[PDB]
Symmetry: D2
Subunit: 336 residues, 4 copies
């Protein structure tokens, strides 16, 4: 029998993690918690605007919903500490609500009976922040709370690591041209968090916004802590994003071909490499955490001084989710 | 000195009502209530994605904000019954939160000290529902709570009235191809009201939805109560909407020219008439409650049996708001 | 060996017909003609914004491109009469350029050597217009030029037939809320055809437009010729469309349940039936020609007089394409 | 009497240039040329998706259209060399077709009888490239063909000049997150220029693309020739754009406040300054060629090595047009 997973917050990441977990043996979602009725949950699992119809069968049943014959218990409890995790034998909670993004707060799940908690976002507190295939080996299995970092962090980390390992990273600035997300308002309206830019119509604007991804890349790659920073422009695509990274390197006389070859060599199931002139919708549903795009590599040289820019695609939904589920699996396998 | 208006809910309609009130003498907004800080409020008044920069000067001051030298007191009180309306001499509350859409609930403003309440939506309970220039003369000045109807009701009313007055309305069905609004989710997510369609990405879908507009047109035009019904398709424009009305008329041998001439004759500052082949973005900001579009008139005749279809544009924002503020002005003038 | 297909115009419908043909045994595309280089053709086959990555392998070769090991000859010839159809043994041309939508013009392919021509649109001239599973049996195999009708015609036909067969169709009007297409301008600009509405920014507007679908439904269902008419509102989704049909029926005391059951009974691989509260993106990629949506049925009754409204979803792209390919297959099978 | 202007290509820039010219005394548009009928031209002048209704009156007359009582002659001649510029006394052609972007080609207008040509784009050949208020004083009045550079170049120039003048520009890389434009396809289709990216659905994608803006900034600012490079991401807003510039400076220990103060001091009617948290739709219609946005300034410092990033907004339409008309006015004034 599988590792028993409970998803807290059946949102974009929660539901896609659910879908992704269907295709990973030894992981089962036995429970889902949100703030809504079961008809809504089943409906949002079946139908997904950007990610497509769920392929299996979804049925509403007493106390939850059944997916391909398998019963998922569901709950409507805003306070995680009151969830029946001890009774259900939860091995790991995928904390995907956006409201427990901190070690202390996530501990609610451990009190409620979960053995571990993996947060679908950056989190404050004394915990590890993990981008799979960049630093997942920093896990030893004894962690009770882990962060899977952010989508952007997952797109950035393998890129920054190659730049650092192969060229020496001096410093850099990043912009992610990022799809709009649920914390953005549909029409211009007050924003819960006081952000005057997330306050504006999501799908009608280029919207500058913050992110920690680059500032907190040091949590994932300690040897470059403090060397990156940058922000985001939220733009009107519902999913699919691009990280542009502009860097100063230690190596001199760096060429486009050298940067690209180095990226290619470091490719794996988390870090994709393409030379095709693709655009954002081509990466919707992709399971790479980061797709390095060699067509966008630039090297500006003035005398002995070089700036190097690179760009990596990610589906800020599915790319992140696939990374999150890998980390989940690995976290489980090490714990047993 | 002016009629003293308080806007409850500085939302899309609230803020646009504020802007529209700036250009109507004898009306002042002296107070605004919402659920946010003053920086947000001032910012959302200044900048508006679809409706353009606010032309005057907006400044944050102690206890509110100043618009062109005029002080607006602001509040952060989700329970209307606790607002200082008595102390401020509120003559009318523009109820624009979407949460007091019922005579009894809106009564909280009366208890708080407001003389009158006008609700920016259809509302249940023993009150009048008013589309300016279609039934505003049903007001006598003694009403304490009034509904300004919906945007769709305001687009539909003058059209249905002409159809009825001039041709006899037997029955009809309506569809409004309607811009998305703030009650719709940015990304597929749980919907507060359990509506599986309003739950979906607002700007990425054709989304079928309900409305009362047609079913409750009887509140505005009693002589055609129960003769209309229909729904909405929410589509990805951030504002600007079209109402398509398909009717069976008692008059025989009706022609396109007849329908069109009849609409033109009935035109005023609430009901515009056009023969130009416009599209939705051409009516953004317009102050007609309803723009009859003659180019879309159709008459299908099979023997003696005719179906007649017409279409009317409205800016679900500014068109409704202009109607609302006319009704507010009139309600005030009759009260004195 | 398969029926030998040439696709003229590797556009939206051309490429999707290509994809669809890959999964239908006894049909092969041996030739493609457009107005561009092979790199472009291959690229647009591989990547598709709304329809997803092509699953197989696509490679540019000398004189064309190779798909999963199979060679496709390609051409760049604007005058179809000059195509090497005789030399290539073309059994059927999928005419998908939008520029040969007439029997006489399409004859260019017969002169160039193709045995038959099937047009991806309504076409003038002495030829048959075919919606698969509604009137495809009107084909005997001796036709040299055939039209596959339009996307709208395919969504409307099975619906209209069931209304007529089961209830008696007196008359009706139709609106399709339709995704924007390639003959719509990106930004407001002159339009090649003089259409002041198709001239406007496709993805920023609700745009009223014509269609023949309903006026020429008589070509597909002769027994209701002249009884339907209507138009379109083009809206900003890149694909996925909805047909609303409002009708007068002969049968009295018709209920929603009756209309819905009658539609359900008529369902097949061309005509789907759903009771789920889906939205346009849920039909992207679907292969039904028409998805009847029971949640949108309405019956308006005033005394003895009834209006009945129904709505059917279609992917104006894939739904039409799947229909087109079925008709192509059938046309081939009857010819041999 | 005014400088007699003829607009070649009544497109986005052409029509907006027309509108802008209505509010600049001593400039008249007496003639317009495009590839379409007068009804379309007049319609597209009246109605504008992003830029709003034309305020004055537009009327179709014999041989052109009348704007506020003033006759504009119109033509339908793809070959500029055949235009009746001698007969009409054209002082300056605003070359806005996108098809004459080269000194030699634009010379067709001089042969046709125009005294001068100003091109609404970067242009090859022996001519000056002008960004108003950055290098317009490089004009002496004897030029017959001039380029007004690109929208991006206009947003970047005043920024780059300040960085250079005040800090010493070593090198930099730029990204413009740019609104989609008319040479982008509506749906994925072959692209006239073989660009596999401009080939994609303009409003559904983040689309990487080239620009010369930065590489040819050296035409406008010769003292920094060859020190900048960069590209674009076309995203789904219909207008309004942001230029991010990441730079290495000679001055050490630069702060955010220094960069911002430096930008503020250089502000004028071409180069605006804001500290407001605006978004793209807030700059639609603005007449600054560049709006420097202080909220986005970043300085990354690792020991003694700094990267400085800044961003300036521009309405790629109206910002560019306003700059183009300023350069037109000035070019005329010096010529007389
Ligand atoms: N959308 C993305 O690109 C993306 C990518 C990576 C990481 N993330 C992170 O994942 C988290 C969620 O993001 P999302 O886009 O899935 O958001 P979402 O809003 O789609 O989903 C959050 C869900 O949590 C539910 N919820 C809220 N409070 C709850 C409570 N206390 N108890 C139970 N359920 C509750 C909501 O009802 C909602 O369904 C955030 O921290 C976010 O930053 C998002
Ligand atoms: N938007 C339209 O096109 C449209 C048209 C006509 C009528 N309406 C109606 O107007 C009302 C508001 O619409 P909107 O589009 O402006 O929505 P919105 O979300 O912009 O406005 C809601 C505003 O009210 C505030 N609010 C919510 N609860 C509150 C509380 N109890 N106390 C104080 N403030 C509170 C919110 O913070 C927000 O500012 C709804 O009834 C809606 O149906 C909307
Ligand atoms: N939803 C839809 O877009 C859809 C659905 C049903 C039917 N149709 C019809 O099918 C046809 C094609 O539709 P589409 O959207 O795929 O077209 P499209 O705009 O994508 O382009 C069709 C292709 O024809 C090519 N072509 C090849 N030879 C040509 C020549 N001789 N002249 C002109 N073009 C040539 C063009 O380059 C283009 O790639 C049209 O008749 C259309 O109305 C489209
Ligand atoms: N943001 C912008 O759209 C923008 C900004 C700066 C510069 N520009 C540049 O200005 C130019 C115009 O751009 P646009 O956006 O207005 O393009 P557009 O397609 O909107 O307008 C081009 C117009 O020229 C017409 N035309 C008239 N005579 C022609 C002929 N002889 N041959 C070919 N076409 C003819 C076309 O019908 C069309 O209306 C291009 O160089 C473009 O790069 C565009």
């Amino acid at each position: 029998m599988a590792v028993k997973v409970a998803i807290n917050g059946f949102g974009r990441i929660g539901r896609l993690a659910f879908r992704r977990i269907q295709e990973v043996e030894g992981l089962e979602v036995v429970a889902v918690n949100d703030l809504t009725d079961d008809d809504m949950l089943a409906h949002l699992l079946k139908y997904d605007t950007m990610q497509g119809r769920f392929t299996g069968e979804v049925e509403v049943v007493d106390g939850g919903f059944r997916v391909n014959g398998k019963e998922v218990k569901s709950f409507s409890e805003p306070d995680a500490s009151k969830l029946p995790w001890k009774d259900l034998n939860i091995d790991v909670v995928l904390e995907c609500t956006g409201f427990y993004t901190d070690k202390d707060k996530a501990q609610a799940h451990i009190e409620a009976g979960a053995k571990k908690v993996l947060i679908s976002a950056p989190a404050t507190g004394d915990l590890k922040t993990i981008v799979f295939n960049t630093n997942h080996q920093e896990l030893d299995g004894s962690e009770t709370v882990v962060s899977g970092a952010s989508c952007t962090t997952n797109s950035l980390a393998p890129v920054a690591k190659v730049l650092n390992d192969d060229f020496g990273l001096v410093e850099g600035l990043m912009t992610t041209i990022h799809a709009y997300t649920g914390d953005q308002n549909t029409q211009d309206a007050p924003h819960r968090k006081g952000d005057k830019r997330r306050a504006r119509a999501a799908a009608e604007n280029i919207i500058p916004n913050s992110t920690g991804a680059a500032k907190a890349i040091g949590k994932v790659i300690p040897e470059i802590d403090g060397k990156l920073d940058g922000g985001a422009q939220r733009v009107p695509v519902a999913t699919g994003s691009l990280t542009e990274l502009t860097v100063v390197l230690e190596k001199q006389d760096v060429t486009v071909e050298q940067v690209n070859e180095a990226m290619k060599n470091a490719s794996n199931e988390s870090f994709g490499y393409t030379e095709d002139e693709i655009v954002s919708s081509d990466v919707v549903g992709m399971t790479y955490g980061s797709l390095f795009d060699a067509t966008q590599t630039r090297v500006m040289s003035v005398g002995d001084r070089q700036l190097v820019k690179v760009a990596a695609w990610y589906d800020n939904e599915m790319s992140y989710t696939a990374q999150l589920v890998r980390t989940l699996a690995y976290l489980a396998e090490l714990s047993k």
